[model samples]
Target: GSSGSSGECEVYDPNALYCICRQPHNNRFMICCDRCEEWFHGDCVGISEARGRLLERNGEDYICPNCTILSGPSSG
Candidate 1:
């Protein structure tokens, strides 16, 4: 018997951009905003690795700054 796909390694699309930096995803810590469901760099977003892990463990929601400000109360 032979396998069709043999490579265990994988690669992300070079053109597929992510985060506010508009860079491709790499092997680093990142988080997805619950509001927008978009991925962001933990460091760029000012979220430390420990904090990201904590949120994952606690199963809490994370709303990105953009979403947070957008949802803020507007002036009457």
Candidate 2:
């Protein structure tokens, strides 16, 4: 969501089937799922290195850990 007027920052739902971000610390910048509306940390998803690299290399346009997994490699 938009964090709206609740003033309470909406956190990433751990139970969500598809979450992008995972950590909620220092009230840092949160990520909102464009497909699922879920929120999470770029690091908590899975691709910590990739996330960081993407952030450093091309800002936030890069795929998230969840999305990365879905796009490449199999978790089986």
Candidate 3:
């Protein structure tokens, strides 16, 4: 199975709170954000429900719960 990025094992910085990886699609790669900076298969991250849906509906600039809360609220 192709795990994207030439099927390379995604490496993450454990020191970082969020685990984001560069996703290879159509020969181009982009960052796919994660809460723990841990690498998981696209399907493993509930792609169809959360990540995929957000990418589909919102395009880039999507933030997960951990990142979202840290960014502060709109009213604040």
TM-score: which candidate is best?
Answer: 1
Model 3 regions lying over 4 Å from their true place: 1-31, 34-51, 54-58, 73-76
Q: Across residues 7-63, which tens digit of lDDT does each residue of candidate 3 receive?
A: 444334343332245333322222356444443334434344455556756766444
Model 2, 1-76: lDDT tens per residue? 5663444444354433333333344243445554335656555754454555556557564344565555654464
Expressed as tens digits, the lDDT of each residue in 1-76 for candidate 1 is: 9868655543365656778888777777889888789998888887788888888889988766766766774462
Residue 34 displacement (Å), model 3: 8.8
What's model 1's lDDT at 71? 70
Query: Which should have the higher lDDT, number 2 or number 3?
Result: 2
Candidate 2 wrongly placed segments (more than 4 Å): 1-26, 33-37, 46-60, 73-76
C-alpha RMSD of each candidate structure in angstroms: 6.4, 8.1, 11.0
CA lDDT of each candidate?
Answer: 0.77, 0.48, 0.44
